[PDB]
């Protein structure tokens, strides 16, 4: 199906940082009708996922700021210009365009050690 | 505020049966596209079913066909999930999804109900 391929798999951060996370598509997301249905979720430790930014560059209902996403094709971006402890935890691309909907490896935020 | 709470999970044996719930608060139960989704340990995220606000299923994966049923009793505002033949690999926390028109994918998730296989 599409895979969607999270680099890094792991990225230690230092509160206040400015980082970017990577999603590449198996198979281009702008080969039907359905362009760039990419959307990414976080994963809280503890907490369930949350919708934060839907069809690339959409933030969803109670997104701050500071989240902001790009691309097209099959390179995506999750841009966050200054994490927060609440931005720590488990992202996820997922991909609509295609059947079925499926999600990424996962890109986990944590604090360096 | 939206509010999903699935339930059923346990312990299970190996080829038993499952049946989970979520019940769902906050939103217009009846007009949403609902999914189930399963995290294993690993904290891989997969599909496992989607149905209509006309409770007919929409989607399935071929690794389950004939072991999954995905319904709904939109008066009762709840969402079910039936798995049969239980295998080693069907242990998972089990999410219920709302599906989004916008977003045209999941857009609130329950806390999830988990479902441990044992021999
Ligand atoms: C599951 C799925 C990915 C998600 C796709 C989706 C995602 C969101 C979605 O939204 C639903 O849209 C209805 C509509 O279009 O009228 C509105 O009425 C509902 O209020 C809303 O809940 C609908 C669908 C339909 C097909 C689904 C695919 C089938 C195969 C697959 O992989
Ligand atoms: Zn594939
Ligand atoms: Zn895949
Ligand atoms: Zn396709």
């Known amino acids: 199906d599409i895979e969607l391929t999270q680099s890094p798999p792991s990225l230690p951060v230092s509160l206040g940082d400015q980082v970017s996370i990577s999603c590449r598509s198996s198979?281009?997301?702008?080969?039907?009708?359905?362009?760039?249905?990419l959307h990414w979720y976080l994963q809280k430790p503890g907490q369930s996922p949350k919708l934060v930014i839907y069809?690339?560059?959409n933030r969803f209902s109670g997104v701050p700021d500071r989240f902001s996403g790009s691309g097209s094709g099959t390179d995506f971006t999750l841009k966050i210009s200054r994490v927060a402890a609440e931005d720590l935890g488990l992202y996820f691309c997922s991909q609509s365009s295609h059947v079925p909907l499926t999600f990424g490896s996962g890109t986990k935020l944590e604090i360096k050690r | 505020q939206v509010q999903l709470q699935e339930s059923g999970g346990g312990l299970v044996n190996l080829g038993g049966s499952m049946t989970l719930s979520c019940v769902a608060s906050?939103?217009?139960?009846?007009?949403?596209?609902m999914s189930w989704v399963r995290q294993t340990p690993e904290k891989t995220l997969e599909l496992v079913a989607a149905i209509n606000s006309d409770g007919e299923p929409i989607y399935y994966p071929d690794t389950l066909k004939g072991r999954v049923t995905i319904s709904r009793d939109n008066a009762k505002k709840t969402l079910y999930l039936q798995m049969s033949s239980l295998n080693f690999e069907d242990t998972a926390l089990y999410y219920c999804?709302?599906?989004?028109?916008?977003?045209?994918?999941?857009?609130?998730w329950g806390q999830g109900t988990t479902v441990t296989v044992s021999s």
């Open positions: 906050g939103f217009t139960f009846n007009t949403y596209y």
């Open positions: 069809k690339v560059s």
């Open positions: 999804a709302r599906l989004n028109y916008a977003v045209y994918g999941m857009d609130y």
């Open positions: 198979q281009s997301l702008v080969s039907n009708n359905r362009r760039n249905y």
